[PDB]
Amino acid sequence: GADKALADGLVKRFGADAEKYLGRQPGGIHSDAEVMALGLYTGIHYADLNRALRQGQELDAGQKLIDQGMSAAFEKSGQAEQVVKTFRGTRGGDAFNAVEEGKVGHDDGYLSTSLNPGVARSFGQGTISTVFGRSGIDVSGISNYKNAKAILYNKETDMRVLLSASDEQGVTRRVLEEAALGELSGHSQGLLDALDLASKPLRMRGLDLA
Amino acid sequence: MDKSELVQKAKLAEQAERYDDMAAAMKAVTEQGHELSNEERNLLSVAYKNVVGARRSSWRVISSIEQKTERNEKKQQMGKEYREKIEAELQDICNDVLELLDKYLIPNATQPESKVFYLKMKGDYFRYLSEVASGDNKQTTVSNSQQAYQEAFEISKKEMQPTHPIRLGLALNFSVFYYEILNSPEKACSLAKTAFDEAIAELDTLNEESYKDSTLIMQLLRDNLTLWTSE
Amino acid sequence: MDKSELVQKAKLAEQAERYDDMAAAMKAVTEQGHELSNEERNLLSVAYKNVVGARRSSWRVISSIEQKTERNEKKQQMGKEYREKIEAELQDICNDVLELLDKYLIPNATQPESKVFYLKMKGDYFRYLSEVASGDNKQTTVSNSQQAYQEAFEISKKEMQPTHPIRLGLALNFSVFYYEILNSPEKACSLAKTAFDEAIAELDTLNEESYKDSTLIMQLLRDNLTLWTS
Ligand SMILES: O=C(O)CCc1nc2sc3c(c2c(=O)[nH]1)CCC3
């Protein structure tokens, strides 16, 4: 009904360009309006849409549907079962450049990331990030140019910088974790303690005051 | 006593922070001649890390006091004796744990991950012996520390990922062996650089099980490198 | 072994945080049958505070796990055994301590400050015994804790200032004995109130620089009081 309204909207304003993604997930966690928006995005609109979201300008009538259609999909989905190692590369700087190591931050636009470490390189050798999350959508079913096998993370989805380091090549190599996975996540039970790493980790006198 | 009973007492003694009983329980489990499970290996390693570490602190403390307090032929003899009492314990803790490595842990270990872990651990307890060791005996314990680390290092390069917490952990302790024991910052840095450079290059090789584990050890390397190379 | 040699090893063992050796050194100094100097008394008291305290924590730690994991009859039996092994250690440390108090420390102590300090300590180590003690034996260790505290308390009232860190210290532990061991908050707050209100009434005599020692212990008393009236 609301999904029918958004599905009717996306087609009325994008035609066959939107209509070509109908029934790409015969599994069907997501609606027709949700599958279409994600595909429209993954295909070509990821350019202009994230351009408008990052720059904080007013979205256009078409952009607005792709956005509300993608947001709809991230709700339905939520935090999955296993942690997903995905890679995302940029030409120059990323919104995580000002986020200091240990602290958290977010990219104002949607975070398109790949399963292929090679196709993430294809997008730039400015910053090469490895992302571990659980609230990502596998749009590889809907669009998959250069066999990207993309996993998209929501807009303004908060990430913790676990490691930010530079190459002798100059390329800054980051490791981001989806904030909501916690502090406990990412460690093998007591391995760090057993490794016994070579690094450093109100009363006065005798009266036993209890 | 049963393998499971000893491991339950070993898990119990840890919470109680009775690391001496925790060590005795795991020593018994090891002496059963069977290859330890990842949990068992971790319980043994933390027990002895804590037992040996307790005397390493006490030793450094008394050695610090040995130097600060220097006037009386008797008061200084009191210090030498107490330093020597603690050296005696450190030597015996390292001997139990190095004998466990030689007799059971290293021979029984079949997977490479474990064979590296224990060989790194052999260098660790030889390094602790080296810290207190003197002259000809120091020469022997330093030679043995370097050999155990080097043997594990060649295996870690062949059969392991540059981002493995075990490979990275060995790389941090060996670089600390060169900087502290052999007093070669050049050797120390060279090792830490390579281990880091190889890891930053292949962050796609991170495990989803131990990613936070690796980044932590990678930070410690990157920090020592920038600290050792700073004026 | 020389008295001075043992005290040097006792001072040394403290920095090394080898409180078991620190306790053995001071036990030997006490067994010499001479009245301990303020420093010696303080070295003995911190050594055993730490030795006994270590097992008090370990005991509470295993006891919490004992009740939280009544899933398996063998895993539970592992718990009971380890709790009992620690109870053994606790009992033996408190036996070492109380035997030192009865045989040497309390008979030999001559000034009132001394005779209160050790009688308060006698009450403390009986209280620690009471925490783990069962039935008829618990009845005995609770009776003995109350008696040692009460004996010291009468002496502290007669021969000591209401602001003395030792008198305040005993008042602190005895009110905690009533609240924790006898489970009488009424008895606990009544004692803590009196000890505090007598100390606020006569603090006008600031003991030159010792009006930091007393203010600290006075806080702990006032802070427990306001917490109990919840
Ligand atoms: O505008 C953007 O989204 C940032 C640049 C960028 N885009 C993309 S899309 C895509 C990837 C990627 C990327 O790495 N950077 C890899 C999975 C598919």
Author numbering:
A (entry chain C): 232 to 432, 445 to 453
B (entry chain A): 3 to 233
C (entry chain B): 3 to 232
What does the paper say about this structure?
Two of these, exotoxins-S and -T (ExoS; ExoT), are homologous enzymes consisting of an N-terminal GTPase-activating protein (GAP) domain (73% identity; 81% similarity) and a C-terminal ADP-ribosyltransferase (ART) domain (78% identity; 87% similarity). The ADP-ribosyltransferase activity of ExoS and ExoT and their cellular toxicity are dependent upon association of the ART domains with 14-3-3 proteins. Here we present crystal structures of human 14-3-3β in complex with the ART domain of both ExoS and ExoT. Collectively, our results indicate that 14-3-3 proteins act as exotoxin chaperones rather than activators.
We co-expressed 14-3-3β with either ExoSE379A,E381A or ExoTwt ART domains in Escherichia coli (for details, see the Supplementary Methods section). Using immobilized metal ion chromatography we isolated hexahistidine-tagged ADP-ribosyltransferase domains of either toxin—ExoS233-453(E379A,E381A) and ExoT235-435(wt)—in complex with untagged 14-3-3β. A protein complex with an apparent molecular weight of roughly 83.5 kDa (indicative of a heterotrimer: an ExoSE379A,E381A monomer bound to a 14-3-3β dimer; expected molecular weight 83246 Da) readily crystallized under various conditions. We obtained crystals in space group C2 that diffracted to 3.22 Å and contained one heterotrimer in the asymmetric unit. The 14-3-3β complexes of ExoS and ExoT looked very similar overall, and the STO1101-bound ART domains alone (C chains) aligned with a root mean square deviation of 0.97 Å.31Fig. Our crystal structures revealed an extensive interface between 14-3-3 and the ExoS and ExoT ART domains. This site involves the C-terminal α-helices-8 and -9 of 14-3-3β, and can be sub-divided into two parts: (i) The two proteins bury a common hydrophobic core made up of side chains originating from the 14-3-3β C-terminal helices and the central β-sheet of ExoS/T (primarily strands β4, β7, and β8). In all our protein complex structures, the phosphoprotein-binding site of the exotoxin bound 14-3-3β protomer was occupied by an amphipathic peptide containing the LDLA-box in a short α-helical segment (ExoS residues 420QGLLDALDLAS430) in which the D427 side chain hydrogen bonded with the 14-3-3β Y127 and Y130 side chains, and the hydrophobic side chains formed hydrophobic interactions within the amphipathic groove of 14-3-3β. In one of our crystal structures of the 14-3-3β:ExoS heterotrimer, the residues connecting LDLA-box-1 and -2, E433-D442, could not be modeled; but we found unambiguous electron density placing LDLA-box 2 in the phosphoprotein-binding site of the second 14-3-3β protomer. LDLA-box 2 bound in a configuration that was highly similar to the configuration of LDLA-box 1 in all four structures.
